[PDB]
Design a protein around this nucleic acid. Structure first.
Ligand SMILES: Nc1nc2c(ncn2[C@H]2C[C@H](O)[C@@H](COP(=O)(O)OP(=O)(O)O)O2)c(=O)[nH]1
Ligand SMILES: [Ca+2]
Ligand SMILES: [Ca+2]
Ligand SMILES: [Ca+2]
Ligand SMILES: [Cl-]
Ligand SMILES: [Cl-]
Ligand SMILES: [Cl-]
Ligand SMILES: [Cl-]
Ligand SMILES: [Cl-]
Ligand SMILES: [Cl-]
Ligand SMILES: [Cl-]
Ligand SMILES: [Cl-]
Ligand SMILES: [Cl-]
Ligand code: NA
Ligand code: NA
Ligand code: NA
Ligand code: NA
Length: 326
DNA sequence: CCGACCGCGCATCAGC
DNA sequence: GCTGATGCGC
DNA sequence: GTCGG
């Protein structure tokens, strides 16, 4: 909230380029500019001041000078008044509708939540589920509920096999008072990078959580990534709990630390961390960190014993999850 | 004054 | 079936 | 849109 006006302004322009113009690199440019302004420890006074930061160029500095002088931005006033632009934006908020499908619907005259429910035969399984819980998925999750959900997941995993290990990540791990959804990192001695000694390791766990009626729906599912829906049990004659998005990612036991770093985030922290890695000569994904060659290829993975080891390779002071909250 | 931009899981489509 | 691309998501 | 090749 230090420079809250500017970073809100740029986040709004970022969404317009992603969802309407389908310019993903203009989207990423606006998120970078808003995120560096957010870490800047002063109240900004001019476009020429902001231009000194990396990722603010001539055009964004001219927009900050308009906003500080007038309290508004004209380009965002036209965007906000364009019906077609604003319909396309709203549609992408449904799980499973992106910019491509949102523009095709709007070109076909489908432009409200009522229009969607009337045209359910134009939607795939994913989009239909995202429409079903649309209001529920717009809601935050209090840390007190995340606590109960974690107790249920850890207890049932232990009943399947006591050698599984499950860890709640995402914004919860970063200490947030509320989260957007629940993210679970899972490992088992039988799935390593070297060998898969047992079948259906992820399937076995989804199944047990379905049979005690914790998981309620599947958006997508493979051998390592599950994307779906879940719900806490309610008491007699109390309002049910909102349904919630859940993601479970099975990672090889020996690559747990790269995996838990990716899964803890945030998204723009990850993006900035991997960009810095590149200018230091490495590449980071959720499995490994590797160095790059003169060709550009990645070499063999480097040993890792902790989250801190990865910050060390790229020469970063360690950051506890609560300070990765960009 | 043009050409790249973090990295990948799952579902589906074109050309073969 | 496969590549390689599009689309949507973490 | 920005930065760097
Ligand atoms: N490299 C990279 N990592 C990402 C990206 N999006 C998400 N991740 C990671 C960081 C997130 O904390 C984690 C879970 O996704 P999320 O639930 O949308 O984020 P969150 O609100 O819990 O932080 O996935 C992404 O776009 N790029
Ligand atoms: Ca998530
Ligand atoms: Ca989350
Ligand atoms: Ca995100
Ligand atoms: Cl772009
Ligand atoms: Cl307005
Ligand atoms: Cl009608
Ligand atoms: Cl809320
Ligand atoms: Cl389902
Ligand atoms: Cl399900
Ligand atoms: Cl798979
Ligand atoms: Cl890898
Ligand atoms: Cl670049
Ligand atoms: Na700059
Ligand atoms: Na309008
Ligand atoms: Na969406
Ligand atoms: Na992709």
């Amino acid at each position: 909230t230090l420079n809250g006006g500017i970073t809100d302004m740029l986040t709004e322009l970022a969404n317009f380029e992603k969802n309407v113009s389908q310019a993903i690199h203009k989207y990423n440019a606006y998120r970078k500019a808003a995120s560096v302004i957010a870490k800047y420890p002063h109240k900004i006074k001019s476009g020429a001041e902001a231009k000194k930061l990396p990722g603010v160029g001539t055009k964004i500095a001219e927009k900050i000078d308009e906003f500080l002088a007038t309290g508004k931005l004209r380009k965002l006033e036209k965007i906000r008044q364009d019906d077609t632009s604003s319909s396309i934006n709203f549609l992408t908020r449904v799980s499973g509708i992106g910019p491509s499908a949102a523009r095709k619907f709007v070109d076909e005259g489908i432009k409200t939540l009522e229009d969607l429910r009337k045209n359910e035969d134009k939607l795939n399984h994913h989009q239909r589920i995202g429409l079903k819980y649309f209001g529920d998925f717009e809601k935050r999750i209090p840390r007190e509920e995340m606590l109960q959900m974690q107790d249920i997941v850890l207890n049932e995993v232990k009943k399947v096999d006591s050698e599984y290990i499950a860890t709640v990540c995402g914004s919860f791990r970063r200490g947030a008072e509320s989260s957007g959804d629940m993210d679970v990192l899972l490992t088992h001695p039988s799935f390593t990078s070297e060998s898969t000694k047992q079948p259906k390791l992820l399937h076995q766990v989804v199944e047990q959580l379905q049979k005690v009626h914790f998981i309620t729906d599947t958006l997508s599912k493979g051998e390592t990534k599950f994307m779906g829906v879940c719900q806490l049990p309610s008491k007699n004659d109390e309002k049910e709990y909102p349904h919630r998005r859940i993601d479970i990612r099975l990672i090889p036991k020996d690559q747990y630390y790269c995996g838990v770093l990716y899964f803890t985030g945030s998204d723009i922290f990850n993006k900035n961390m991997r960009a810095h890695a590149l200018e230091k000569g490495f590449t980071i994904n959720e499995y490994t960190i590797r160095p790059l060659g003169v060709t550009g290829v990645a070499g063999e993975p480097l040993p890792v014993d902790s989250e801190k080891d990865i910050f060390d390779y790229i020469q970063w002071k360690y950051r506890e999850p609560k300070d990765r909250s960009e």
